Design an enzyme around this catalytic site. Sequence first.
Site, short mmCIF file in Angstrom:
data_model
loop_
_atom_site.label_atom_id
_atom_site.label_comp_id
_atom_site.label_asym_id
_atom_site.label_seq_id
_atom_site.Cartn_x
_atom_site.Cartn_y
_atom_site.Cartn_z
N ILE A 12 0.84 -1.18 0.00
CA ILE A 12 0.00 0.00 0.00
C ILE A 12 0.89 1.24 0.00
O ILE A 12 0.43 2.33 0.38
CB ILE A 12 -0.88 0.04 1.27
CG1 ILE A 12 -0.07 -0.48 2.46
CG2 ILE A 12 -2.15 -0.81 1.07
CD1 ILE A 12 -0.42 0.20 3.76
N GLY A 13 2.14 1.05 -0.41
CA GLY A 13 3.15 2.10 -0.40
C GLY A 13 3.65 2.59 -1.74
O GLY A 13 3.27 2.09 -2.81
N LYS A 14 4.54 3.57 -1.68
CA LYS A 14 5.08 4.26 -2.87
C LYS A 14 6.29 3.60 -3.55
O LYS A 14 6.16 2.66 -4.36
CB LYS A 14 5.45 5.69 -2.46
CG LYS A 14 5.90 5.77 -1.02
CD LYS A 14 6.61 7.06 -0.68
CE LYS A 14 7.46 6.84 0.56
NZ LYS A 14 8.29 5.63 0.30
N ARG A 16 9.87 5.67 -3.52
CA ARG A 16 11.02 6.60 -3.57
C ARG A 16 12.08 6.31 -2.51
O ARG A 16 13.25 6.19 -2.82
CB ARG A 16 10.53 8.04 -3.40
CG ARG A 16 9.55 8.55 -4.50
CD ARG A 16 9.90 9.99 -4.93
NE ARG A 16 9.88 10.93 -3.82
CZ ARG A 16 10.40 12.16 -3.88
NH1 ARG A 16 10.97 12.57 -5.01
NH2 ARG A 16 10.35 12.97 -2.84
N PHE A 17 11.67 6.17 -1.25
CA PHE A 17 12.64 5.93 -0.18
C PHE A 17 12.31 4.69 0.67
O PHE A 17 12.34 4.75 1.89
CB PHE A 17 12.69 7.17 0.70
CG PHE A 17 11.88 8.33 0.18
CD1 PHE A 17 10.61 8.59 0.67
CD2 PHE A 17 12.40 9.16 -0.80
CE1 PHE A 17 9.87 9.67 0.21
CE2 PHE A 17 11.67 10.24 -1.28
CZ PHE A 17 10.40 10.50 -0.78
N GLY A 18 12.00 3.56 0.04
CA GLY A 18 11.64 2.37 0.80
C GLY A 18 10.30 1.85 0.30
O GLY A 18 9.85 2.33 -0.74
N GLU A 19 9.68 0.90 0.99
CA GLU A 19 8.38 0.41 0.55
C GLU A 19 7.42 0.11 1.70
O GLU A 19 7.82 -0.41 2.73
CB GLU A 19 8.56 -0.82 -0.32
CG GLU A 19 8.69 -2.11 0.44
CD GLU A 19 8.94 -3.28 -0.47
OE1 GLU A 19 8.59 -3.18 -1.66
OE2 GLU A 19 9.46 -4.30 0.01
N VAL A 20 6.14 0.45 1.51
CA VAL A 20 5.16 0.26 2.57
C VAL A 20 4.27 -0.95 2.37
O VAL A 20 3.93 -1.34 1.25
CB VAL A 20 4.29 1.54 2.74
CG1 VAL A 20 3.41 1.42 3.97
CG2 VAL A 20 5.18 2.77 2.85
N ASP A 134 9.52 18.12 3.71
CA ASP A 134 8.92 17.36 2.60
C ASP A 134 7.39 17.15 2.83
O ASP A 134 6.86 16.05 2.66
CB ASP A 134 9.60 16.00 2.44
CG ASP A 134 9.23 15.30 1.14
OD1 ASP A 134 8.93 15.99 0.15
OD2 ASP A 134 9.27 14.05 1.11
C1 LIG Z 1 7.15 5.53 10.06
C2 LIG Z 1 6.34 4.74 9.09
C3 LIG Z 1 6.04 3.37 9.28
C4 LIG Z 1 5.26 2.72 8.30
C5 LIG Z 1 4.81 3.42 7.16
C6 LIG Z 1 5.14 4.79 7.02
C7 LIG Z 1 4.72 5.63 5.87
N1 LIG Z 1 5.60 6.50 5.28
N2 LIG Z 1 4.83 7.07 4.30
C8 LIG Z 1 3.57 6.66 4.21
C9 LIG Z 1 3.37 5.71 5.20
C10 LIG Z 1 2.09 4.96 5.48
C11 LIG Z 1 1.56 4.94 6.79
C12 LIG Z 1 0.36 4.24 7.08
C13 LIG Z 1 -0.30 3.56 6.05
F1 LIG Z 1 -1.42 2.91 6.33
C14 LIG Z 1 0.19 3.57 4.73
C15 LIG Z 1 1.40 4.28 4.45
C16 LIG Z 1 2.80 7.33 3.12
C17 LIG Z 1 3.89 8.28 2.55
C18 LIG Z 1 5.23 8.09 3.33
N3 LIG Z 1 5.90 5.39 8.01
#
Ligand SMILES: Cc1cccc(-c2nn3c(c2-c2ccc(F)cc2)CCC3)n1
Length: 301
Positions: A12-14, A16-20, A134
């Site tokens: 569910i992440g982007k 650029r600097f890692g992955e969610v 940012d």
């Molecule tokens: C510190 C930390 C831990 C885990 C994720 C993140 C986190 N970093 N970022 C996002 C999330 C994020 C948080 C909750 C969610 F439901 C989906 C994405 C969106 C853009 C940058 N940041």
Amino acid sequence: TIARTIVLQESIGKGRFGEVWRGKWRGEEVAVKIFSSREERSWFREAEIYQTVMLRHENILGFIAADNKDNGTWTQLWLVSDYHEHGSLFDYLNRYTVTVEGMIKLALSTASGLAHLHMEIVGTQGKPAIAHRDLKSKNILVKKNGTCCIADLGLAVRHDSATDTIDIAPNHRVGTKRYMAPEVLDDSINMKHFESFKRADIYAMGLVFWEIARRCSIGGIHEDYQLPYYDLVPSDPSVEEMRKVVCEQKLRPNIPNRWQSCEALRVMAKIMRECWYANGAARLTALRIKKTLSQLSQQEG
Ligand SMILES: Cc1cccc(-c2nn3c(c2-c2ccc(F)cc2)CCC3)n1
């Protein structure tokens, strides 16, 4: 103990600097940002920001933990936090139109979160003032209760009011060009004065407020979602392209004249203008913005 008991379910992440990832921990949903071992300095620094500081606030992403979830094959650095089904404010504004109430809620909570960041607390168990560097709609998440919490603190700077120095961040990449403040674009910002950083955060917040307001549906009338300067720059704008629009042409996002047919949109419009001055010293303070938004909040209910 933490990471080892978390089961990942979906991306569910982007990128650029890692992955969610959306995860499951003891029956609860949680968000996890996984950094590869090579991407280790951005990981530590982000963990450092969320930790080394008394940053607990409902309008700042609820940090859970950092865990060097070591694999004997390839380690893997985990950042864990609260999970927000709605996703980014960016995702939110693209999917839903908002009410006058929903708009104040989004804007006020964003402002309180930044206000809490910018706010220093000297002494024993204090909290240093911190600048984001940012802030944008994709770095803000909307909770289930209609409020926001600031995320992505990987590029933040912390102010040491004692020595008046700045605890610089270890990385190789600045912010999002589209939201870069005027001073940052023409590279005239004194990156040695903390106030300058906070002033840059306000300008960017102003752009975010524009994004929200644009989607405030009243009498069924509203504009479609757009990113700031959508009508002046290409996607993934370069510095040069943003500097010519913002600094040389002295341009800011357009403010519909209809936004005066409503008290709330009038206030929002006023705040935006006051965040967009090319002179950072003239911009409003996050705390100030929270106060007027707070007042406008009480009046609406
Ligand atoms: C510190 C930390 C831990 C885990 C994720 C993140 C986190 N970093 N970022 C996002 C999330 C994020 C948080 C909750 C969610 F439901 C989906 C994405 C969106 C853009 C940058 N940041």
